[PDB]
Amino acid sequence: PIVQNQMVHQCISPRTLNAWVKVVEEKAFSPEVIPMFSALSCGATPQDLNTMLNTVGGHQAAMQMLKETINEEAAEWDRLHPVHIAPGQMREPRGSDIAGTTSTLQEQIGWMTHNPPIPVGEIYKRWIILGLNKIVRMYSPTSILDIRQGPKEPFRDYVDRFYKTLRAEQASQEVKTETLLVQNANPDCKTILKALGPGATLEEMMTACQ
Amino acid sequence: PIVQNQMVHQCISPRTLNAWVKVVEEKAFSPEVIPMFSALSCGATPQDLNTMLNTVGGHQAAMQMLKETINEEAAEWDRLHPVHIAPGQMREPRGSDIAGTTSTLQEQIGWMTHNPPIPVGEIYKRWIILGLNKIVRMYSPTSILDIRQGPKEPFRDYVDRFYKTLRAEQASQEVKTETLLVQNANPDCKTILKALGPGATLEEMMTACQ
């Protein structure tokens, strides 16, 4: 990554490398893996991001889908930012340079530490997260329509299952409580929730069915 | 977080990230999780606080309740601090900027390192702790009225259960020893505690029933 000493390059740490490999091994593509990826790649160059992705051993269907998404975003970058070499001068990055495929570490450091900075690490991380979002959605095991409270299931446990599924499915903010959460509750809790009226908070609903 | 080098940004560490994820996994919403959260987020930006909250995989009912509390506090901030862009100048943070939703890391660093400093990390942490307090209270499994000493239960173990419950229930300082602790003791210890008279310290009570 790039850190303050002046902005300088520092090697990716064994702690960082191991943390990422282990979270993928333990959590696969549960939604919380994405914020962990983003945090572990703080200040990362494109090289660092590729290291992190390349160190993953399993899940090669997912990694190939990610590669496709990256290539699509690279192509769209080039369409929106075409480029027309001067001795010792900084060249303009293409999509493949942002993805670390046709750029050197030194070029990446040059862009990231320029004034004004061209944040190729942040741009590439955006594309990677777009790809991971698609994978998380595809690998979500359950539709929100199929999360229904059991006859003997505590309301708290049902709500945990409901919002876990909703997070993975990644519907729009508008689509993403006053509707399906009540409809999918069990007969006894539904009767209680209906009586609360419109505009009840989640806290109030959970208290009511506790 | 923001640290002294001059006040500079430093990436959240893998040790910090892992510690928080593990304490939530191991302790859920036992009261001691809150002081741990506060300590692990020392010097945190709003971005760092969101990273910590976003890396939690389970407990999505709790995380949605927390989101509601944050939104309420953001709205109250805006009501109390309205805002009326000058080139290259620091703008005033709204509630959503304090919560890291509409602000950039660079803006957050700008506010936190200003003279005088606008401590958006500390303000946001306050709102988060308010939310966690509510969750800890809701998820408390036992009322203090139901903590009673068993016939063969050592007084020390009963007092441990009593104050564990009292901590989670979070009654006022005034409400929160000379009353219920004695009344809920077993017949033999109660007789001894009654004879001690008014104003007996906890140490004296524990010695008496040992």
């Binding site: 994405i34 979002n133 990644q170 729009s172 | 606080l49 969101n50 949605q64 919560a99």
Partner: peptide, 9 residues
Amino acid sequence: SPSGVFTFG
């Protein structure tokens, strides 16, 4: 496209 998983911020 999916909305992402960053519940906070």
